[PDB]
C-alpha cells in the first residue's frame, strides 16, 4: 500500500498501543472478561429478534440462539414467500458511512432450504465478496455449512438464480479463491461478479495456527472499494470466526482512515455485539484479533 505521512504515523501509533497490549496479556484478558460481563440478556435478544423467532422462520436458523435483531436484519425485497417478512439470518455490520471503510453482512452458513435466499441477498445487496471461514463439514462429520457454491456435479441453480464458477485458484496460505458469476435465468441484463474466498483452516470456537492466511484475506480486499457493496462474511453461526475477521478488517481500515477510536478494540467488539449477538465468541479469538492487527500493522510499517 502507498501510505500518506498521516497514515504511516497513525499505523506506528496504533502498533505501539496494540503491541503494548500483547506484551501485557492480562490487559487483553481483562477487556474480554469485561465484554462477557456486559453481554445482552436472553430477553434482550429474543424480544428484539421477533421476525427471526417467528414460527414461519425458525427452520431458517442454523442455530436457534443465533438470530439477527429486527433493527438491522437484511430483508429480501422482493421475496417469494409473502408471509416470511423477507427473512434471512443476516445482519448489516457497520461502524460508519465512510466509503473508506467496508460494511459487512454477517450471516450463518446457508442451509439447503436457504440457499436461494442467500444468493438473492447477494444480488439484491450487490455484494462483491464472500468471505467463508468454515469447512462445509468438521472433522467430527458434523455439517457446519450447506454447499451453496460447488459446481463439479454441473452448473448450479437456485430457483430463478443461475451460478457459474469461472475459475478456482488456491494460495500458499490455504485460501481457496473462486471467481463466481450469478444471474437470473430469464433476463438480458449482465451477470454479477462475486469473489468467493474460503479459509478451511480456522476451527470452530478456535483460532488458526498463525495470522498469515487471515491477513492475506485482508490484503486481497484492501483495494475493493467499500462503495461497491457490503462484504458477506460467514462461518457456521456467523458470529465467532465471522466477528473476529470483521474486527481485524474493520480495525485496520479505520486506522488507515484516521479514526482514533479504532484503538479501542473492546468498544469495536461491543458495537458489533449490538448489531449481531455474540460477535467474537472466545477469549482465544479476542487474542487472535490483537495478534492479527499487530502483525498487519508491522507489515504496513515495514
Swiss-Prot record:
Induction of expression: By salt treatment. Down-regulated by cold.
PROSITE patterns from the UniProt entry: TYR_PHOSPHATASE_1 (PS00383), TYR_PHOSPHATASE_2 (PS50056), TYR_PHOSPHATASE_PTP (PS50055)
Single GO MF descriptor: MAP kinase tyrosine phosphatase activity
Subcellular location: Cytoplasm, Cytosol; Nucleus
Broad class of where this protein is predominantly found: cytoplasm
Assembly description: Interacts with MPK6. Interacts with KIN10.
Function as written in the Swiss-Prot or TrEMBL entry: Protein-tyrosine-phosphatase that dephosphorylates and probably inhibits MPK6 in non-oxidative stress conditions. In association with MKP1, represses salicylic acid (SA) and camalexin biosynthesis, thus modulating defense response. May also repress MPK3. Dephosphorylates and inactivates MPK4 in vitro.
Name of the protein: Protein-tyrosine-phosphatase PTP1
Record organism: Arabidopsis thaliana
Lineage: Eukaryota, Viridiplantae, Streptophyta, Embryophyta, Tracheophyta
